[PDB]
Amino acid sequence: QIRIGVMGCADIARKVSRAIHLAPNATISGVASRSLEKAKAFATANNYPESTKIHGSYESLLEDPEIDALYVPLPTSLHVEWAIKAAEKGKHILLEKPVAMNVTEFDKIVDACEANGVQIMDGTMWVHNPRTALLKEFLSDSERFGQLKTVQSCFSFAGDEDFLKNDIRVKPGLDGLGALGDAGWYAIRATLLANNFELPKTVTAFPGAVLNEAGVILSCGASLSWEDGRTATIYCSFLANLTMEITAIGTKGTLRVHDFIIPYKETEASFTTSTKAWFNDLVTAWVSPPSEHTVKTELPQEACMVREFARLVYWPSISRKTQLVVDAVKESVDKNYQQISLS
Amino acid sequence: QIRIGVMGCADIARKVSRAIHLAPNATISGVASRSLEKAKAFATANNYPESTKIHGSYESLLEDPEIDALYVPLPTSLHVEWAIKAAEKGKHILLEKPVAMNVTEFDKIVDACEANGVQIMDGTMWVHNPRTALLKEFLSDSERFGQLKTVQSCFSFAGDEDFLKNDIRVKPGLDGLGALGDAGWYAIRATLLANNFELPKTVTAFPGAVLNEAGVILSCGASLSWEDGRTATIYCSFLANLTMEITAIGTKGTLRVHDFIIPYKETEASFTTSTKAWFNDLVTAWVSPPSEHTVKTELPQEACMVREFAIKNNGAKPDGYWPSISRKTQLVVDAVKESVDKNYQQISLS
């Protein structure tokens, strides 16, 4: 129903087209590129239907009156410009993250979407997976889980040579936020979902960050304490083996997710669970060890995501919440690991 | 054959007592206490052998010529005084962690032990567990793991109101290091262990440390750096649901164990491994999810510990790895608090 236009021939557009496709309330209507030559080839391999119009410019697609909404798979650097130009043309945006090089730029995109009354949603997929429902709640049980104390979050894949050298996520002019923007983002996001999505008191980075010659981050972490007994940590890197964990330590429960970003199988999703856990009298063993739940996801998360993009006309809000923490962490790295209080 | 005495009828002494005679190269030969009545009750309660000489005093047990070594589950603060005296009476030492209120006091204890040739060791039993040999085995292979980067570790649990108010761990005297010495201790060991026993360059406690009204730590954390990529984190809390684990990750490997301090079952031990993991072309699934391993451990780790601790027959000197794997861990434990009460300074371990 909602005519979707893919602005940018990004490799990750191969997965989202599926989302769009599988979303019973959405269809892939338009798609552009710097050269319709590439858009034609992308549309071919990607099994794009025939009615799908092929454009050889971004301006073309933005002025395409038949565009109800857009998915923007462009490098972090083309958001502040192409996002404002998308809304001004009355088109709703599904913006890939990191949303922008800073909250300042994001707000400009938010306001612009507001002035034009359009719906904007970042590209963080996992928060739409069903598992994220029965767990966002698992942490809302003041008994089975209790009062949140701290929450850890990690993520780091292993950028081979070609990646560390050519991928756009190491280029200061393209996806200049590096590991932070591409990976830290997720950790930061979970660190918010565990806390009901409330900005933390302050934010402090750990020393020992790794930036390439151009100064792009390759690895770094940080603690974000709500100063009221709550703290947390994230961790991202382009130099370590694939790992995706969420550690949440509550007063009465403990939650753990070995995946969370892209599950093992798009069909099912699982997470840990533990409450009133203790040892027997002689501390010779655990009396009741943590259990692992599970939920069926008949529709992939990117699918469930796009099937939710239909917001006729929070999302732009929680995006700014993580984008913000994103900057705090980045500001801290260079502002001599200072604590970045968030108002 | 190795006669061991127990100074201080602490509750943790019950578990170690079972470890002592599951030996079979060690036995219970003696037990002491500030009170003979409390020691008389302890010996019989825990089914000690008639042969065990029940001691109604510390000094009395040390001056006992028929006691080869001692297990000292004494409060932290009593260590530097009573451990030393023990070394001075020719008594080897199995000292409970955290070994002391600081490394200076611990150096003395160690130099006292050297001076008498006896062996000293701490109560960190999880390293004697067979699994740990395979954990280090994995972290050692540079092909299925590679160079180390992170190995975060934490330990917490929910202490009842009775604990939070009367346990020796909340007091600033006996075990005055709080959750750091009781819990942070391990997490630090697990990191040092992952980092081939190499201390970090510097230490920087995290913000939001919760100290009581007496300045004793109830929960806290921090990060460590080596100026490579090797960065880790430890977390400890006396007021947060039970949770323990090690999460190490390298260029090619990832290690995971969620019961590294107290195995679910003493019978076996499991650890998960992941080598060069990735996604299918379209990233709709992992090409291969982590691997769960399981090791047989017919002999529980604490007993494996006492078994190793248990020179006097061949003329060998004391093993320096232990007092050294004890000074390193006890050297950093006092690096954290050194930052939690020093304006969050990046303690320079130089």
XYZ file of C-alpha atoms in Angstrom:
693
model
C 0.000 0.000 0.000
C 2.697 2.459 1.085
C 4.821 3.169 -1.997
C 8.435 2.806 -0.901
C 11.392 4.403 -2.623
C 14.957 3.239 -2.018
C 17.266 6.249 -2.107
C 20.779 4.879 -2.493
C 22.143 1.652 -3.946
C 23.605 0.446 -0.640
C 24.442 -3.219 -0.071
C 22.151 -3.263 2.984
C 19.310 -2.335 0.649
C 19.369 -5.972 -0.456
C 18.088 -7.031 2.963
C 15.596 -4.201 3.411
C 13.972 -4.757 0.004
C 13.070 -8.133 1.526
C 11.665 -6.326 4.584
C 9.594 -4.051 2.361
C 8.588 -7.028 0.206
C 7.557 -9.325 3.079
C 5.732 -6.420 4.730
C 2.115 -7.108 3.587
C 1.382 -3.393 3.926
C 4.295 -2.195 1.811
C 5.649 -2.475 -1.709
C 8.907 -1.403 -3.358
C 7.746 1.380 -5.692
C 10.773 3.541 -6.444
C 14.579 3.480 -6.256
C 17.423 5.777 -7.306
C 21.213 6.077 -7.483
C 24.019 8.337 -8.664
C 23.694 6.533 -12.015
C 20.520 4.774 -13.194
C 23.056 2.356 -14.641
C 23.671 1.021 -11.134
C 20.013 1.391 -10.117
C 19.082 -0.790 -13.086
C 21.560 -3.475 -12.059
C 20.519 -3.283 -8.402
C 16.847 -3.534 -9.399
C 17.696 -6.544 -11.558
C 19.547 -8.760 -9.085
C 17.255 -7.614 -6.273
C 14.196 -9.080 -8.013
C 12.575 -5.633 -8.148
C 9.130 -5.792 -9.801
C 8.520 -4.212 -13.198
C 6.381 -1.232 -12.153
C 9.259 -0.140 -9.905
C 10.623 3.075 -11.382
C 14.379 3.480 -11.787
C 15.956 6.888 -11.188
C 19.411 8.234 -12.016
C 19.551 10.926 -9.333
C 18.384 11.617 -5.787
C 16.660 14.826 -6.836
C 14.687 12.861 -9.402
C 13.290 10.498 -6.781
C 12.538 13.293 -4.290
C 10.480 15.102 -6.920
C 8.791 11.863 -7.944
C 5.197 12.712 -6.913
C 4.460 8.987 -6.629
C 6.737 8.624 -3.577
C 4.715 8.144 -0.376
C 7.773 7.358 1.768
C 11.530 6.670 1.627
C 14.246 4.397 3.067
C 17.609 6.169 3.110
C 20.625 3.752 3.051
C 23.091 6.595 2.474
C 26.401 7.060 4.340
C 26.047 8.982 7.595
C 27.281 12.147 5.853
C 24.413 12.458 3.344
C 21.623 12.460 5.923
C 21.628 16.067 7.081
C 21.229 17.075 3.413
C 19.117 14.367 1.779
C 16.836 13.866 4.760
C 15.834 17.550 4.884
C 15.258 17.417 1.107
C 13.117 14.308 1.468
C 10.667 15.792 3.975
C 10.407 19.150 2.203
C 9.002 17.084 -0.675
C 6.407 15.615 1.687
C 7.977 12.173 1.929
C 8.233 10.070 5.088
C 11.677 8.725 5.976
C 13.095 5.446 7.254
C 16.590 6.777 8.069
C 19.516 4.372 8.553
C 21.675 4.962 11.619
C 23.720 6.525 12.956
C 21.066 9.086 11.991
C 23.569 11.911 11.584
C 27.035 13.156 12.500
C 25.452 14.697 15.611
C 22.165 15.510 17.347
C 22.423 19.078 16.005
C 22.074 17.704 12.458
C 19.412 15.196 13.510
C 17.208 17.840 15.136
C 17.400 19.839 11.916
C 16.077 16.715 10.167
C 13.485 16.200 12.888
C 12.188 19.760 12.781
C 12.161 19.678 8.973
C 10.077 16.479 9.106
C 7.849 18.249 11.649
C 7.402 21.415 9.595
C 6.239 19.123 6.789
C 4.335 16.731 9.037
C 6.089 13.511 7.980
C 6.986 10.349 9.889
C 10.658 9.535 10.450
C 12.066 6.275 11.859
C 15.730 5.231 12.241
C 16.978 1.937 10.849
C 17.676 0.099 14.136
C 15.886 -3.159 13.320
C 16.098 -5.377 16.428
C 13.836 -3.199 18.566
C 11.037 -4.413 16.284
C 11.686 -8.120 16.778
C 8.859 -9.749 18.811
C 11.428 -10.925 21.395
C 11.943 -7.275 22.278
C 8.381 -7.167 23.590
C 8.512 -10.176 25.929
C 11.688 -8.940 27.603
C 11.088 -5.206 27.600
C 8.367 -6.473 29.907
C 10.557 -9.133 31.553
C 12.538 -6.180 32.882
C 9.380 -4.335 33.963
C 8.572 -6.934 36.644
C 9.554 -5.316 39.947
C 9.431 -8.824 41.414
C 10.676 -11.292 38.785
C 13.388 -8.775 37.881
C 13.334 -6.033 40.503
C 15.085 -2.657 40.361
C 17.654 -2.251 37.570
C 21.145 -1.749 38.937
C 23.441 -1.811 35.907
C 23.408 -2.849 32.270
C 26.269 -3.916 30.014
C 26.247 -4.063 26.216
C 28.864 -5.282 23.729
C 29.300 -5.619 19.960
C 32.345 -5.942 17.671
C 32.859 -7.713 14.379
C 36.247 -8.398 12.819
C 37.013 -5.961 10.039
C 39.360 -7.800 7.702
C 41.976 -5.917 5.681
C 39.704 -4.831 2.826
C 37.164 -3.479 5.338
C 39.572 -1.539 7.567
C 40.898 0.016 4.392
C 37.929 0.528 2.061
C 34.601 0.258 3.915
C 32.821 3.602 4.412
C 32.687 3.060 8.183
C 36.367 4.038 8.485
C 36.099 7.072 6.184
C 35.904 10.356 8.158
C 33.939 11.966 5.342
C 31.364 9.177 4.948
C 30.426 7.154 8.036
C 32.820 9.089 10.226
C 31.449 7.837 13.559
C 33.269 4.551 12.994
C 32.678 1.673 15.397
C 30.764 4.038 17.682
C 28.172 5.091 15.128
C 27.777 1.669 13.512
C 28.210 -0.611 16.527
C 28.170 1.437 19.727
C 24.768 2.664 18.573
C 23.139 -0.713 19.204
C 24.718 -1.101 22.623
C 23.675 2.445 23.500
C 20.181 1.615 22.261
C 19.809 -1.444 24.510
C 21.248 0.549 27.402
C 18.135 2.664 26.882
C 15.589 -0.114 26.395
C 16.690 -1.644 29.718
C 16.093 1.709 31.433
C 12.672 2.284 29.856
C 14.394 4.595 27.356
C 15.389 7.336 29.786
C 18.567 9.343 29.228
C 21.270 8.527 31.828
C 22.672 11.123 34.239
C 26.146 11.313 32.735
C 28.348 9.312 30.354
C 32.051 8.482 30.635
C 34.310 6.694 28.132
C 37.030 4.211 29.094
C 40.583 5.124 28.125
C 42.295 2.984 25.472
C 40.163 3.895 22.456
C 41.519 3.047 18.988
C 41.267 5.517 16.109
C 42.698 5.015 12.616
C 45.149 7.582 11.204
C 42.257 9.777 10.024
C 41.063 9.615 13.612
C 38.062 7.340 13.058
C 37.151 5.137 16.016
C 37.829 1.408 15.727
C 37.135 0.437 19.339
C 35.971 2.123 22.543
C 33.481 1.770 25.396
C 31.851 3.826 28.159
C 29.925 3.834 31.438
C 26.634 5.734 31.738
C 25.523 6.139 35.367
C 22.065 7.457 36.228
C 23.782 8.545 39.463
C 20.986 6.945 41.521
C 22.546 3.514 41.915
C 22.208 2.733 38.209
C 25.157 2.484 35.822
C 25.876 0.790 32.521
C 28.526 0.121 29.916
C 28.650 -0.395 26.171
C 31.467 -1.667 24.020
C 32.021 -1.632 20.279
C 34.900 -2.527 17.933
C 35.729 -3.286 14.300
C 38.747 -5.289 15.478
C 37.186 -8.106 17.522
C 35.234 -11.302 16.803
C 31.451 -11.130 16.317
C 29.816 -10.778 19.732
C 26.416 -9.295 20.594
C 25.558 -9.196 24.292
C 23.242 -7.307 26.601
C 23.912 -7.657 30.324
C 21.180 -6.327 32.612
C 21.564 -6.683 36.371
C 18.430 -5.996 38.369
C 17.593 -6.173 42.067
C 15.744 -9.493 41.736
C 16.551 -10.636 38.224
C 19.272 -10.947 35.610
C 18.683 -10.667 31.871
C 21.109 -11.756 29.159
C 21.034 -11.741 25.364
C 23.755 -13.516 23.376
C 22.394 -12.049 20.159
C 19.874 -9.175 20.115
C 21.216 -7.558 16.931
C 20.214 -9.970 14.166
C 19.216 -13.242 15.889
C 20.749 -16.618 15.034
C 17.737 -17.490 12.871
C 15.203 -14.932 11.627
C 12.486 -17.391 12.646
C 13.136 -17.687 16.390
C 14.650 -15.468 19.095
C 15.876 -16.312 22.613
C 17.251 -14.706 25.791
C 18.339 -15.666 29.327
C 16.247 -15.345 32.504
C 17.098 -15.526 36.227
C 15.378 -14.583 39.483
C 15.845 -15.375 43.198
C 18.976 -17.233 42.123
C 21.277 -18.473 44.880
C 23.488 -21.334 46.088
C 22.640 -24.236 48.370
C 23.691 -24.102 52.049
C 27.288 -25.144 51.398
C 27.587 -22.956 48.295
C 28.478 -26.199 46.565
C 26.084 -25.393 43.693
C 23.322 -23.181 42.223
C 19.882 -23.943 43.659
C 17.844 -22.646 40.701
C 19.951 -21.648 37.648
C 18.759 -19.126 35.010
C 16.266 -20.254 32.367
C 16.187 -19.475 28.644
C 12.859 -18.339 27.162
C 11.832 -18.138 23.492
C 9.355 -16.565 21.078
C 8.413 -17.337 17.484
C 8.862 -14.561 14.935
C 6.987 -15.723 11.835
C 8.009 -12.436 10.180
C 11.676 -11.245 10.204
C 12.536 -8.160 12.269
C 13.405 -6.047 9.227
C 10.069 -7.341 7.969
C 8.223 -6.543 11.202
C 10.019 -3.191 11.054
C 8.881 -2.153 7.588
C 5.457 -3.589 8.422
C 5.442 -0.955 11.138
C 6.780 1.916 9.037
C 3.153 2.430 8.038
C 2.515 5.335 10.414
C -0.102 7.128 8.283
C 0.451 10.802 9.125
C 8.906 8.352 20.038
C 10.828 6.993 17.061
C 12.457 10.259 16.161
C 12.710 10.794 19.902
C 14.495 7.578 20.947
C 16.669 8.069 17.865
C 17.817 11.428 19.228
C 18.209 9.777 22.606
C 20.768 7.304 21.317
C 22.266 9.721 18.796
C 22.754 12.017 21.781
C 24.440 9.388 23.966
C 26.425 8.630 20.830
C 27.883 12.163 20.840
C 28.384 12.156 24.602
C 30.553 9.061 24.188
C 32.364 10.640 21.224
C 32.738 13.989 22.978
C 34.222 12.186 25.984
C 36.799 10.292 23.928
C 38.238 13.576 22.668
C 37.205 15.818 25.576
C 39.753 13.969 27.707
C 37.498 11.139 28.926
C 35.388 13.665 30.865
C 31.968 12.733 32.222
C 29.358 13.980 29.754
C 26.356 14.898 31.891
C 23.134 14.755 29.879
C 21.156 17.732 31.285
C 49.888 -37.115 54.891
C 49.806 -33.284 54.879
C 48.461 -32.186 58.266
C 46.302 -29.057 57.987
C 44.893 -26.828 60.700
C 41.997 -24.385 60.417
C 42.373 -21.018 62.157
C 38.981 -19.437 62.761
C 35.757 -21.439 62.554
C 34.330 -19.399 59.660
C 31.292 -20.607 57.734
C 33.379 -20.977 54.564
C 35.541 -23.426 56.511
C 32.802 -26.062 56.189
C 33.111 -26.284 52.404
C 36.923 -26.256 52.423
C 36.892 -28.978 55.077
C 35.186 -31.320 52.606
C 37.804 -30.321 50.053
C 40.513 -31.109 52.543
C 39.801 -34.820 52.859
C 38.458 -35.461 49.363
C 42.241 -35.000 49.081
C 43.609 -37.863 49.185
C 46.956 -36.197 49.976
C 45.636 -34.008 52.803
C 43.573 -34.424 55.968
C 42.052 -32.507 58.896
C 44.542 -32.590 61.771
C 43.542 -29.481 63.692
C 41.165 -26.581 64.179
C 41.277 -23.505 66.395
C 39.124 -20.572 67.522
C 39.200 -17.609 69.886
C 36.781 -19.805 71.839
C 37.355 -23.464 72.672
C 33.595 -23.863 73.085
C 32.976 -22.614 69.549
C 35.811 -24.789 68.244
C 34.547 -27.822 70.160
C 31.136 -27.294 68.561
C 32.645 -26.782 65.098
C 34.772 -29.951 65.102
C 31.856 -32.235 66.044
C 29.225 -30.417 63.982
C 31.162 -30.788 60.738
C 32.173 -34.351 61.632
C 35.889 -33.836 62.367
C 37.971 -36.896 63.310
C 38.647 -37.689 66.978
C 42.332 -37.273 66.110
C 41.806 -33.559 65.377
C 43.333 -31.472 68.170
C 40.619 -28.979 69.136
C 42.264 -25.621 69.836
C 40.651 -22.963 71.988
C 43.049 -20.331 70.666
C 44.899 -19.061 67.598
C 48.449 -18.794 68.981
C 47.884 -22.225 70.494
C 47.191 -23.793 67.082
C 50.245 -22.158 65.475
C 52.593 -23.385 68.197
C 51.297 -26.895 67.511
C 54.275 -28.905 66.180
C 51.967 -31.563 64.690
C 50.304 -29.257 62.123
C 52.081 -28.998 58.763
C 49.910 -26.299 57.152
C 46.970 -23.978 57.754
C 43.809 -22.802 56.003
C 43.078 -19.259 57.130
C 39.487 -18.145 56.456
C 40.135 -15.168 58.724
C 38.801 -11.603 58.231
C 40.932 -9.526 55.840
C 42.292 -7.234 58.581
C 43.581 -10.149 60.689
C 45.710 -11.445 57.816
C 48.905 -9.399 57.996
C 49.256 -10.113 61.723
C 48.244 -13.769 62.013
C 49.484 -15.019 58.650
C 52.993 -13.775 59.418
C 53.023 -15.327 62.890
C 51.953 -18.553 61.151
C 54.830 -18.386 58.663
C 57.087 -17.778 61.654
C 56.005 -21.070 63.228
C 56.801 -23.089 60.122
C 53.178 -23.191 58.986
C 52.445 -23.103 55.257
C 49.459 -20.967 54.306
C 46.172 -21.249 52.425
C 45.008 -17.644 52.896
C 41.493 -16.506 51.988
C 41.000 -13.746 49.449
C 41.237 -10.824 49.358
C 44.634 -11.631 50.919
C 45.006 -8.223 52.608
C 43.892 -4.588 52.940
C 46.695 -3.656 50.503
C 49.746 -5.031 48.697
C 52.193 -3.449 51.168
C 50.774 -5.621 53.926
C 50.699 -8.513 51.488
C 54.350 -8.081 50.521
C 55.261 -8.497 54.178
C 53.221 -11.692 54.490
C 54.964 -12.980 51.356
C 58.472 -12.008 52.479
C 57.695 -13.669 55.807
C 56.728 -16.831 53.929
C 59.869 -16.696 51.744
C 61.972 -16.214 54.866
C 60.618 -19.540 56.112
C 60.478 -21.392 52.805
C 56.839 -22.335 53.405
C 54.241 -22.091 50.653
C 51.433 -19.533 50.627
C 48.317 -19.533 48.456
C 44.946 -17.755 48.353
C 41.463 -19.243 48.298
C 40.755 -18.542 44.599
C 39.511 -22.071 43.837
C 37.992 -21.582 40.351
C 41.463 -21.672 38.762
C 42.117 -25.218 39.962
C 38.997 -26.396 38.120
C 39.917 -28.478 35.041
C 37.765 -26.259 32.824
C 40.145 -23.383 33.541
C 42.952 -25.341 31.857
C 40.849 -25.462 28.686
C 39.803 -21.798 29.061
C 43.477 -20.768 29.075
C 44.041 -23.369 26.363
C 41.566 -21.502 24.146
C 42.711 -17.963 24.978
C 46.256 -19.241 24.266
C 45.630 -20.425 20.694
C 46.200 -17.552 18.274
C 44.222 -19.251 15.501
C 40.736 -19.824 16.918
C 40.889 -16.607 19.003
C 43.891 -14.501 18.016
C 44.997 -11.386 19.888
C 42.973 -10.547 23.028
C 40.870 -7.366 23.146
C 38.148 -7.577 25.762
C 37.557 -9.959 28.638
C 35.061 -8.108 30.805
C 34.011 -9.876 33.973
C 31.599 -9.211 36.774
C 30.250 -10.799 39.923
C 27.174 -9.888 41.941
C 24.417 -11.310 44.116
C 21.536 -10.175 46.322
C 22.423 -10.063 49.997
C 19.506 -10.036 52.435
C 18.944 -7.154 54.864
C 20.726 -9.223 57.524
C 23.817 -9.411 55.316
C 23.779 -5.740 54.344
C 23.765 -4.899 58.043
C 25.825 -7.517 59.875
C 28.208 -9.306 57.495
C 31.952 -8.869 57.991
C 32.085 -7.678 54.369
C 30.144 -4.475 54.991
C 32.336 -3.555 57.967
C 35.464 -1.391 57.418
C 37.701 -3.613 59.543
C 37.720 -7.400 59.151
C 36.781 -7.667 55.471
C 36.723 -3.925 54.819
C 37.253 -3.958 51.056
C 33.595 -4.783 50.549
C 32.258 -6.111 47.253
C 35.661 -5.419 45.650
C 37.598 -7.940 47.710
C 34.762 -10.452 47.929
C 33.511 -10.162 44.354
C 35.646 -7.772 42.303
C 38.571 -9.974 43.323
C 37.691 -12.779 40.897
C 36.630 -10.628 37.950
C 40.118 -9.152 38.201
C 41.724 -12.612 38.326
C 39.785 -13.628 35.234
C 41.142 -10.564 33.427
C 44.743 -10.933 34.565
C 44.443 -14.623 33.686
C 43.166 -13.811 30.190
C 45.991 -11.280 29.798
C 48.688 -13.878 30.402
C 48.997 -12.596 33.968
C 50.108 -9.179 32.786
C 48.806 -6.278 34.891
C 47.282 -3.327 33.037
C 49.244 -0.109 32.422
C 46.726 1.943 34.376
C 43.400 1.586 36.190
C 40.435 3.989 36.251
C 37.447 3.292 38.499
C 34.016 3.982 36.951
C 31.697 6.767 38.167
C 28.803 5.894 40.463
C 30.596 3.753 43.030
C 28.306 3.026 45.994
C 30.145 3.378 49.315
C 28.292 2.982 52.619
C 28.229 5.472 55.500
C 31.529 3.971 56.683
C 33.283 4.231 53.318
C 33.065 0.508 52.572
C 32.331 -0.481 48.955
C 28.945 -2.067 48.245
C 29.353 -2.154 44.456
C 31.716 -0.775 41.806
C 33.594 -1.253 38.537
C 36.255 0.092 36.178
C 38.236 -0.484 32.998
C 41.831 -1.568 32.412
C 44.237 -0.661 29.617
C 47.501 -1.959 28.193
C 47.773 0.509 25.274
C 47.141 -2.092 22.569
C 43.447 -2.774 22.267
C 43.490 -5.077 25.241
C 40.845 -3.410 27.367
C 38.674 -5.081 29.984
C 36.102 -4.321 32.655
C 35.148 -5.709 36.051
C 31.919 -5.184 37.973
C 30.990 -6.141 41.539
C 27.895 -5.672 43.681
C 26.608 -6.889 47.040
C 23.137 -5.531 46.273
C 22.324 -6.877 42.800
C 20.983 -10.292 41.749
C 23.425 -13.214 41.538
C 25.286 -13.127 38.197
C 28.813 -14.220 37.268
C 30.636 -14.708 33.972
C 33.661 -14.090 31.789
C 33.317 -12.611 28.306
C 36.585 -12.550 26.368
C 36.870 -11.705 22.673
C 39.709 -11.695 20.178
C 40.224 -11.056 16.463
C 39.183 -14.675 15.792
C 37.661 -15.939 19.036
C 35.098 -15.245 21.742
C 34.943 -16.971 25.128
C 31.922 -17.237 27.399
C 31.298 -18.803 30.786
C 28.497 -17.750 33.150
C 29.493 -19.820 36.186
C 33.264 -19.326 36.311
C 33.361 -18.720 40.080
C 30.852 -21.310 41.340
C 29.960 -23.950 38.718
C 26.283 -24.869 38.386
C 27.201 -28.456 39.275
C 30.515 -29.528 40.819
C 30.363 -32.614 38.601
C 31.041 -30.843 35.293
C 31.900 -27.396 33.891
C 30.895 -25.752 30.610
C 32.285 -22.906 28.503
C 31.122 -21.579 25.143
C 33.402 -20.868 22.200
C 33.013 -18.900 18.955
C 35.669 -18.720 16.229
C 35.550 -16.363 13.231
C 31.753 -16.004 13.331
C 29.792 -14.334 10.559
C 26.444 -13.976 8.797
C 24.994 -15.510 5.627
C 25.296 -13.343 2.488
C 22.112 -11.430 3.345
C 22.691 -11.203 7.132
C 19.406 -12.937 8.020
C 21.229 -15.409 10.273
C 24.639 -16.345 11.757
C 26.437 -18.886 9.577
C 27.323 -20.750 12.772
C 26.228 -20.039 16.406
C 28.670 -20.438 19.359
C 29.773 -23.890 20.565
C 28.981 -25.201 24.050
C 31.643 -27.421 25.621
C 31.543 -29.582 28.741
C 34.322 -30.962 30.928
C 34.155 -33.867 33.363
C 35.337 -32.895 36.851
C 34.976 -35.916 39.158
C 36.896 -33.918 41.755
C 35.422 -30.516 42.746
C 37.661 -27.472 42.194
C 38.163 -26.553 45.862
C 39.340 -30.098 46.556
C 41.501 -29.856 43.459
C 42.864 -26.683 45.091
C 43.696 -28.092 48.519
C 44.967 -31.044 46.484
C 47.573 -28.835 44.751
C 48.494 -26.771 47.818
C 49.064 -29.999 49.754
C 59.527 -29.339 49.860
C 59.019 -31.063 53.231
C 59.868 -34.418 51.644
C 61.964 -33.589 48.551
C 63.549 -30.271 49.484
C 61.827 -28.073 46.917
C 61.251 -24.368 47.570
C 57.830 -22.715 47.704
C 56.085 -22.111 44.374
C 56.317 -18.440 43.469
C 53.469 -18.466 40.955
C 50.852 -18.443 43.676
C 52.117 -15.637 45.896
C 52.731 -13.920 42.549
C 49.314 -14.713 41.058
C 48.142 -13.382 44.393
C 50.113 -10.145 44.467
C 49.010 -9.278 40.926
C 45.314 -9.725 41.693
C 45.673 -8.176 45.144
C 47.796 -5.449 43.592
C 45.009 -4.282 41.277
C 42.129 -4.736 43.696
C 43.788 -1.848 45.526
C 44.059 0.109 42.265
C 40.297 0.443 41.894
C 39.533 1.851 45.351
C 42.668 3.897 44.743
C 40.603 5.686 42.081
C 37.134 5.521 43.690
C 38.602 7.732 46.428
C 41.081 9.844 44.463
C 38.838 11.788 42.036
C 38.440 8.920 39.564
C 42.145 9.104 38.726
C 43.541 6.721 36.136
C 45.749 4.907 38.669
C 49.139 4.290 37.049
C 50.310 0.778 37.866
C 54.016 1.534 37.380
